[PDB]
Write an enzyme that holds these catalytic residues in place. Structure first.
Site, PDB file in Angstrom:
ATOM      1  N   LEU A   1       1.447 -15.224  13.983  1.00 32.02           N
ATOM      2  CA  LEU A   1       1.307 -13.944  14.665  1.00 32.02           C
ATOM      3  C   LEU A   1       0.507 -12.925  13.824  1.00 32.02           C
ATOM      4  O   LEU A   1      -0.013 -11.934  14.367  1.00 32.02           O
ATOM      5  CB  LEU A   1       2.687 -13.385  15.043  1.00 32.02           C
ATOM      6  CG  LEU A   1       3.708 -14.385  15.610  1.00 32.02           C
ATOM      7  CD1 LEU A   1       5.044 -13.684  15.830  1.00 32.02           C
ATOM      8  CD2 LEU A   1       3.216 -15.017  16.899  1.00 32.02           C
ATOM      9  N   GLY A   2       0.393 -13.185  12.518  1.00 32.31           N
ATOM     10  CA  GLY A   2      -0.324 -12.303  11.605  1.00 32.31           C
ATOM     11  C   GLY A   2       0.176 -12.430  10.172  1.00 32.31           C
ATOM     12  O   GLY A   2       1.369 -12.627   9.948  1.00 32.31           O
ATOM     13  N   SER A   3      -0.755 -12.346   9.210  1.00 28.48           N
ATOM     14  CA  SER A   3      -0.458 -12.455   7.776  1.00 28.48           C
ATOM     15  C   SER A   3      -0.657 -11.096   7.120  1.00 28.48           C
ATOM     16  O   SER A   3      -1.344 -10.233   7.663  1.00 28.48           O
ATOM     17  CB  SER A   3      -1.367 -13.487   7.079  1.00 28.48           C
ATOM     18  OG  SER A   3      -1.564 -14.640   7.865  1.00 28.48           O
TER      19      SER A   3
ATOM     20  N   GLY B   1       1.049  -8.414   3.559  1.00 27.92           N
ATOM     21  CA  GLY B   1       1.953  -8.150   2.446  1.00 27.92           C
ATOM     22  C   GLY B   1       3.413  -8.395   2.825  1.00 27.92           C
ATOM     23  O   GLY B   1       4.277  -8.512   1.953  1.00 27.92           O
ATOM     24  N   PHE B   2       3.677  -8.451   4.132  1.00 29.44           N
ATOM     25  CA  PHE B   2       5.002  -8.782   4.667  1.00 29.44           C
ATOM     26  C   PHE B   2       5.261 -10.291   4.478  1.00 29.44           C
ATOM     27  O   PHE B   2       6.366 -10.705   4.119  1.00 29.44           O
ATOM     28  CB  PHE B   2       5.156  -8.340   6.145  1.00 29.44           C
ATOM     29  CG  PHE B   2       3.964  -8.663   7.039  1.00 29.44           C
ATOM     30  CD1 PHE B   2       3.863  -9.899   7.684  1.00 29.44           C
ATOM     31  CD2 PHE B   2       2.946  -7.710   7.247  1.00 29.44           C
ATOM     32  CE1 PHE B   2       2.759 -10.182   8.517  1.00 29.44           C
ATOM     33  CE2 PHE B   2       1.825  -7.990   8.073  1.00 29.44           C
ATOM     34  CZ  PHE B   2       1.738  -9.211   8.720  1.00 29.44           C
TER      35      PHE B   2
ATOM     36  N   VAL C   1       4.328 -14.457   9.474  1.00 27.60           N
ATOM     37  CA  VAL C   1       5.272 -14.464  10.596  1.00 27.60           C
ATOM     38  C   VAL C   1       4.830 -15.374  11.701  1.00 27.60           C
ATOM     39  O   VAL C   1       3.641 -15.411  12.046  1.00 27.60           O
ATOM     40  CB  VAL C   1       5.427 -13.085  11.225  1.00 27.60           C
ATOM     41  CG1 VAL C   1       6.690 -13.018  12.095  1.00 27.60           C
ATOM     42  CG2 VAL C   1       5.421 -12.035  10.163  1.00 27.60           C
TER      43      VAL C   1
ATOM     44  N   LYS D   1       9.745 -15.443   9.465  1.00 29.38           N
ATOM     45  CA  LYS D   1       8.968 -14.832   8.422  1.00 29.38           C
ATOM     46  C   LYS D   1       9.205 -15.529   7.116  1.00 29.38           C
ATOM     47  O   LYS D   1      10.324 -15.618   6.647  1.00 29.38           O
ATOM     48  CB  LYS D   1       9.392 -13.385   8.300  1.00 29.38           C
ATOM     49  CG  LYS D   1       8.449 -12.519   7.511  1.00 29.38           C
ATOM     50  CD  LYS D   1       9.146 -11.201   7.177  1.00 29.38           C
ATOM     51  CE  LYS D   1       8.227 -10.242   6.456  1.00 29.38           C
ATOM     52  NZ  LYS D   1       8.652  -8.822   6.497  1.00 29.38           N
TER      53      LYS D   1
ATOM     54  N   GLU E   1      14.776 -11.769  15.703  1.00 28.32           N
ATOM     55  CA  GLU E   1      14.622 -11.778  17.163  1.00 28.32           C
ATOM     56  C   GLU E   1      13.173 -11.461  17.482  1.00 28.32           C
ATOM     57  O   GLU E   1      12.503 -10.769  16.726  1.00 28.32           O
ATOM     58  CB  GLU E   1      15.554 -10.803  17.916  1.00 28.32           C
ATOM     59  CG  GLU E   1      16.160  -9.688  17.114  1.00 28.32           C
ATOM     60  CD  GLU E   1      16.754  -8.592  17.991  1.00 28.32           C
ATOM     61  OE1 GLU E   1      17.731  -8.870  18.740  1.00 28.32           O
ATOM     62  OE2 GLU E   1      16.264  -7.451  17.905  1.00 28.32           O
TER      63      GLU E   1
ATOM     64  N   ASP F   1       8.186   2.796   5.255  1.00 23.72           N
ATOM     65  CA  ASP F   1       6.894   2.361   5.751  1.00 23.72           C
ATOM     66  C   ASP F   1       6.789   2.565   7.258  1.00 23.72           C
ATOM     67  O   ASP F   1       6.327   1.690   7.986  1.00 23.72           O
ATOM     68  CB  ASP F   1       6.716   0.901   5.402  1.00 23.72           C
ATOM     69  CG  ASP F   1       5.269   0.460   5.428  1.00 23.72           C
ATOM     70  OD1 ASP F   1       4.376   1.338   5.410  1.00 23.72           O
ATOM     71  OD2 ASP F   1       4.966  -0.745   5.480  1.00 23.72           O
TER      72      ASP F   1
END
Ligand SMILES: Nc1ncnc2c1ncn2[C@@H]1O[C@H](COP(=O)(O)O)[C@@H](O)[C@H]1O
EC number: 2.7.11.1
Length: 273
Positions: A12-14, A16-17, A20, A35, A89, A135
């Protein structure tokens, strides 16, 4: 038994988190997000009431899980040799506030008022649970497009809420307060209120107000779009330069501009479907 309780969707996207992923908890076909967070790239650690060492992200999420749909709920977490895998979720269909603004531009005040109100309720929930997000920004807000419900995500830059001064910060700078920029010192709530003023300006103007350090410090707000006087008042109050001149959450929610909010479902029927 094991992590085999989850089929794995697409990315779904990369960032610093972490990384996911869409997912489908096979126990009951429930939609989840997975994640992955590398051990190596975690700086802030903490511990569970039982005394286990985990990433602060987990500690914070556990504290904010209740029936309230305003924060992403953590359903489970696993510990891989080099990474903490998190189960979360996943609403569907969904789009984050950043992408929603990118496509639709500045939001009508009514929409911005419903959205802002929901974020205020979610931040209050976190604080009431002893958690400070640190954040708050449009990328970290998910919109459940069916129910018109907003959801705060990514507590990976957060900290336990306290009343003393914070002198560490690893959130988004253009959203960080003038006291963080000038002195490397801030208090939780006032800093949170600053980021919410940035976020409110973002929603009603289509973009953030400041891009550079000097602009933050100077705190001069220029409106590039037509925005009501009441809304400009609230924004400017949230962006008061002195932390003590900022409004409390109660003051924000009792502000004239915030009155007569639409319910989530009304919000969707008028502005999303
Ligand atoms: N659909 C989703 N897309 C991206 N992140 C999600 C999604 N659902 C839940 N999350 C959680 O939200 C955070 C993503 O971080 P960020 O993209 O910086 O807002 C992670 O903590 C994810 O586990």
């Amino acid at each position: 038994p094991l992590e085999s309780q989850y089929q794995v969707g697409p990315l779904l996207g990369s960032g610093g988190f972490g990384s996911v992923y869409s997912g489908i908890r096979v126990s009951d076909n429930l939609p989840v997000a997975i994640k992955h967070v590398e051990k190596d790239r975690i700086s802030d650690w903490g511990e569970l009431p039982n005394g286990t060492r985990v990433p602060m992200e987990v500690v914070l999420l556990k504290k904010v899980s209740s029936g309230f749909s305003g924060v992403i709920r953590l359903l489970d977490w696993f510990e891989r040799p080099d990474s903490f895998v998190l189960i979360l979720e996943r609403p569907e269909p969904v789009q984050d506030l950043f992408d929603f603004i990118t496509e639709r531009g500045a939001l009508q005040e009514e929409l911005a008022r419903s959205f802002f109100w929901q974020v205020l309720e979610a931040v209050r929930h976190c604080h009431n649970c002893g958690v400070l997000h640190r954040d708050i920004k449009d990328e970290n807000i998910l919109i459940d497009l069916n129910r018109g419900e907003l959801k705060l995500i990514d507590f990976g830059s957060g900290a336990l809420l306290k009343d003393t001064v914070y002198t560490d910060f690893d959130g988004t700078r253009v959203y960080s307060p003038p006291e963080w920029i000038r002195y490397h010192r801030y208090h939780g709530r006032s800093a949170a209120v600053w980021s919410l003023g940035i976020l409110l300006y973002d929603m009603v103007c289509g973009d953030i107000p400041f891009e550079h350090d000097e602009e933050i410090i100077r705190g001069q707000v220029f409106f590039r779009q037509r925005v009501s006087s009441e809304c400009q008042h609230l924004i400017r109050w949230c962006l008061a330069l002195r932390p003590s001149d900022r409004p409390t959450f109660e003051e924000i929610q009792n502000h004239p501009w915030m009155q007569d909010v639409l319910l989530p479902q009304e919000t969707a029927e008028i502005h999303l479907h």
